[PDB]
């Protein structure tokens, strides 16, 4: 298969900016390249076809350029309605393949996450399991490293995270990391902590609680 690599995976922009997204094919695709826009929960929408043609009804601020293996989608005057995800489609060979995508999100000032840790509830422990929840509230940018520490021991493979979409009012993000253990394993250690690393904080913030007490 032909490998399409889009760059960057995500880009921060402001209304009015000139934005450029690139797509690189592993080999020459004869300009058989299309570009699509996709918004959450909706089907994609064509923007550009044959590498450089503006599809019918598409705002002229969108334009495609390139040939060979290098292609670029340019949005000349970023509009509020332009914040979405963009994909290239390659048809220079069957099967057709898409790039990984490029999410264009709203740029705003650096906002440090307010961190909170929740111990498992007595009612859940009673059922045999233990979920410890770490909350990172209203932060920007998106990148955040959340590490779990049980009695100073770094955890791996037993946590899952979830992030909200950018808030419509303050353009920040929220994240939750859930450490899941059996009651048995949970009772084998006392100190439970989540260390959060983010651009908005001097050095890593650590939230913890001594088990039970």
């Amino acid at each position: 298969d032909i490998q399409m690599t889009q760059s960057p995976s995500s880009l921060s922009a402001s209304v009015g900016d000139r934005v450029t997204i690139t797509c690189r094919a592993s080999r020459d695709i004869k300009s058989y390249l299309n570009w699509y826009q996709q918004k959450p929960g909706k089907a994609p929408k064509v923007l550009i076809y044959y590498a450089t043609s503006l599809a019918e009804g598409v705002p002229s601020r969108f334009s495609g350029s390139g040939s060979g293996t290098d292609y670029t989608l340019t949005i000349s005057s970023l509009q509020p309605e332009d914040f979405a995800t963009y994909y290239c489609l390659q048809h220079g060979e069957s099967p057709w393949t898409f790039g990984q995508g490029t999410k264009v999100e709203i740029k705003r000032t650096v906002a440090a996450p307010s961190v909170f840790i929740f111990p498992p509830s007595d009612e859940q422990l009673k059922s045999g399991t233990a979920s410890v929840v770490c909350l990172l509230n209203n932060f920007y940018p998106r990148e955040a490293k959340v590490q779990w520490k049980v009695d100073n021991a770094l955890q791996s493979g037993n946590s899952q995270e979830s992030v909200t979409e950018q808030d419509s009012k303050d353009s920040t993000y929220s994240l939750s990391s859930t450490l899941t253990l059996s009651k048995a394993d949970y009772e084998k250690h006392k100190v439970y902590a989540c260390e959060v690393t983010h651009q908005g904080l001097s050095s890593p913030v650590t939230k913890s609680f001594n088990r039970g007490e």
Binding site: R27, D28, K30, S67, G68, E93
Partner: protein
């Protein structure tokens, strides 16, 4: 600007597996060259055979297939039929344009080999009156349809003034062709021996006159 070379001609028999190749002068033929193969049958009828290096065009028999063997693109015919006799052109894409190869005339033997009947004609006295002289060399009944013509004047090769027609097929499916040696009446008078050389399958057939 890049040169694409193909074998001039190839001869096979029904049932045979034949391989025509296509070479790029820039380097190895790659999938980015989108190797394309086109079949030119008699009466200037073109039909795509292979596209995108190895994709058989819809409708094309399963016996045709394309690929990359070594650093060249190739068209393999597995069980060559008589219907497959034609000229096969190769085309490679170089980022923004196509360059064609010289084509390969493929012969699928449907009759015994046949040597060319050669006939060389001196210039007429009528034409000499115009101070010009034309030697006419007719070449008929040869199969397969590929020959090379050469001229000689008094034992030495002539490198200028000759012109030969591209072989065309006659009613019996063999081929015919013609060559011309253009001289002034002076040159015709100054020399005494002229020969028309026709080489077919490596053997030279010759006609001379005084």
């Amino acid at each position: 600007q890049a040169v694409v070379t193909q074998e001039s001609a190839l001869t096979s028999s029904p049932g045979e597996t034949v391989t025509l190749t296509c070479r790029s002068s820039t380097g190895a033929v790659t999938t980015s060259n989108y190797a394309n193969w086109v079949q030119e049958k008699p009466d200037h009828l073109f039909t795509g055979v292979i596209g995108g290096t190895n994709n058989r065009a819809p409708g094309v028999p399963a016996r045709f297939s394309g690929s990359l063997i070594g650093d060249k693109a190739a068209l393999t015919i597995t069980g060559a039929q008589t219907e497959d006799e034609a000229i096969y052109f190769c085309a490679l894409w170089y980022s923004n344009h196509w360059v064609f190869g010289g084509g390969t005339k493929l012969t699928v033997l449907g009759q015994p080999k046949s040597s060319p009947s050669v006939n060389l004609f001196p210039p007429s006295s009528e034409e000499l009156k115009t101070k010009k002289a034309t030697l006419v060399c007719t070449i008929t009944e040869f199969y397969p349809g590929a020959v090379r013509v050469d001229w000689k004047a008094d034992g030495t090769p002539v490198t200028q003034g000759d012109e030969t027609t591209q072989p065309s097929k006659q009613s019996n499916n063999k081929y015919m062709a013609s060559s011309y040696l253009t001289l002034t009446a002076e040159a015709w008078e100054s020399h005494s021996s002229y020969s028309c050389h026709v080489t077919h399958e490596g053997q030279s057939v010759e006609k001379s006159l005084s």
